[PDB]
Amino acid sequence: SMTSHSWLCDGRLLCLHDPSNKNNWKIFRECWKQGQPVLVSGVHKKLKSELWKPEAFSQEFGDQDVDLVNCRNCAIISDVKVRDFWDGFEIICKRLRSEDGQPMVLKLKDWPPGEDFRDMMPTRFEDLMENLPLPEYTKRDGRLNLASRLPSYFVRPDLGPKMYNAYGLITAEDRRVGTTNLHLDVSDAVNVMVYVGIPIGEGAHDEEVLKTIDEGDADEVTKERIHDHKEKPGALWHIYAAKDAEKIRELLRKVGEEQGQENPPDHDPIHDQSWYLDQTLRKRLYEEYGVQGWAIVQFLGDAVFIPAGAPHQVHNLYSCIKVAEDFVSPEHVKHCFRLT
Numbered sequence: 644s645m646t647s648h649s650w651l652c653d654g655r656l657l658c659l660h661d662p663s664n665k666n667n668w669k670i671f672r673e674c675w676k677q678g679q680p681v682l683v684s685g686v687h688k689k690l691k692s693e694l695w696k697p698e699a700f701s702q703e704f705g706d707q708d709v710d711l712v713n714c715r716n717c718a719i720i721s722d723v724k725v726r727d728f729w730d731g732f733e734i735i736c737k738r739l740r741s742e743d744g745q746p747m748v749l750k751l752k753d754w755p756p757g758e759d760f761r762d763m764m765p766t767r768f769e770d771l772m773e774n775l776p777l778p779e780y781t782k783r784d785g786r787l788n789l790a791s792r793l794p795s796y797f798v799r800p801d802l803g804p805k806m807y808n809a810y811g812l813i814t815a816e817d818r819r820v821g822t823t824n825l826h827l828d829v830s831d832a833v834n835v836m837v838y839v840g841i842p843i844g845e846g847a848h849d850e851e852v853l854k855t856i857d858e859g860d861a862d863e864v865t866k867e868r869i870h871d872h873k874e875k876p877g878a879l880w881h882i883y884a885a886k887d888a889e890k891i892r893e894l895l896r897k898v899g900e901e902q903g904q905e906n907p908p909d910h911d912p913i914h915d916q917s918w919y920l921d922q923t924l925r926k927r928l929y930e931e932y933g934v935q936g937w938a939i940v941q942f943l944g945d946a947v948f949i950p951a952g953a954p955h956q957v958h959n960l961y962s963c964i965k966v967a968e969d970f971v972s973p974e975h976v977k978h979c980f981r982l983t
C-alpha cells in the first residue's frame with residue numbers, strides 16, 4: 644500500500660514517500676522546527692534519467708581543466724581533464740593509479756565551478772529546480788525561503804545548485820575515510836542523489852559495503868531496505884544536532900591533543916573540515932559526551948534535508964552524483980545572523 648510517510652532511525656527520522664505531494668509541509672514542519680534532518684524518497688522518478696549519466700558529462704564537458712582529490716590521503720591532482728575523472732567513474736580498469744599501482748578513489752573538486760551550474764548546464768538546472776521537494780522552502784523564490792529577502796546582517800548562501808561527484812570507497816582501510824569530512828553550513832540544504840554507479844572489473848565488491856552500513860550504525864529498517872535489493876545505496880551520512888556542535892569540538896580537541904597535534908585551546912576542529920568520525924570516534928562521542936546522531940543511507944533518488952548549524956559527514960559506498968541547493972528557512976535563520 645502507498646503511504647504518505649514512514650520512520651527510520653527507530654522513529655527519530657521522517658521519511659516522506661511522494662516528493663511532489665502538496666500536503667508534505669504539514670508532516671515536515673513539525674520535525675524541521677525540532678532541528679531534525681528529513682529524508683524524501685523517489686526524486687529520481689521525477690527527473691530525465693538521460694541528463695544525469697556519467698557518459699553524457701564526459702561527452703559534453705570532457706575537455707574542461709579541473710583538480711581532483713585522492714580521498715585516501717587528501718593529495719591534490721592538479722590541472723587534468725574532466726574526462727580523466729568521468730571515464731573511470733564505473734569502469735575500474737580506466738582509473739588514474741597511485742604510485743602503489745592501485746586504482747585511486749577520487750573526488751572531482753568544485754565542478755561546475757563557483758556559481759556556474761546554471762550557465763554551463765541550463766537543461767539540468769531546469770530539471771532539478773522544477774522537481775525539488777518542499778518547494779516553498781527549497782526554490783530560489785519560495786515563500787518560506789528567506790535567502791533573497793535578508794539584509795547584510797545575515798550570511799546569505801551563494802547561487803546554486805552545487806554538484807558533488809566522487810568514486811565509492813572500496814577497502815576495509817577505506818571504512819575510516821570520508822568523501823566529505825565533518826563540517827557545518829550556516830544555511831539549510833537539500834542534497835539529491837541523481838545517479839549511483841556500481842562498478843564492474845573489481846565488481847563482486849558487495850560484501851565490504853554491507854559491513855560498512857552495519858558498523859556505520861544503520862537501523863534495521865534501513866538494513867531491510869539494503870538486504871532485499873530493489874534500490875541502489877549511494878552514501879552513508881552521519882548528521883548531528885546543531886545544539887551538540889560544541890560537545891563535538893571538545894571531543895576533537897581532546898583527540899587532536901592525544902594524537903600530538905599542537906592546537907590553541909579555542910581552535911575550531913569542525914570549521915577545519917579535517918576530521919571523519921569512524922566507529923571508534925562515534926562510540927567515544929556517545930559514551931564520553933552523551934551525544935547521539937542520525938546514521939542515514941542515501942539511496943538513488945533520496946533527498947537529504949540538512950538543518951543549518953548541524954555538523955555532518957558523507958562516506959560514498961559506490962560512485963555518486965549528488966546535486967544540492969542551499970536555502971534559509973524561517974525555523975533556522977538564527978544560525979546565519981552576524982551578531983550576539
Ligand SMILES: COCCNC1CCN(C(C)=O)CC1
Binds near residue numbers: 849852872876
Ligand atoms: C534497479 O536496482 C538495481 C539494484 N542494484 C543492487 C543494489 C544493492 N547493491 C548492494 C547492497 O551493494 C548491489 C546492486
Ligand SMILES: [Cl-]
Binds near residue numbers: 678885952974975
Ligand atoms: Cl536550530
Ligand SMILES: [Cl-]
Binds near residue numbers: 763764766768
Ligand atoms: Cl544542460
Ligand SMILES: [Cl-]
Binds near residue numbers: 668776777778779780
Ligand atoms: Cl512546501
Ligand SMILES: [Cl-]
Binds near residue numbers: 823
Ligand atoms: Cl572534505
Ligand SMILES: [Mn+2]
Binds near residue numbers: 826827828955
Ligand atoms: Mn555540507
